[PDB]
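tokens incoming
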């Protein structure tokens, strides 16, 4: 969905998996790898 550069991460101290744009430093709960 969203662009190349969005990549999987985990929200420290709770474990919520989310995505982080490794090109812009943006963050979202939507997974752009689909």
């Amino acid at each position: 969905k969203l662009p190349p550069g969005w990549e999987k991460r985990m929200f420290r101290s709770n474990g919520t998996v989310y995505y982080f744009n490794h090109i812009t430093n943006a963050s979202q709960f939507e997974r752009p790898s689909g």
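note: Strands lie at 6-11, 16-21, 27-28.
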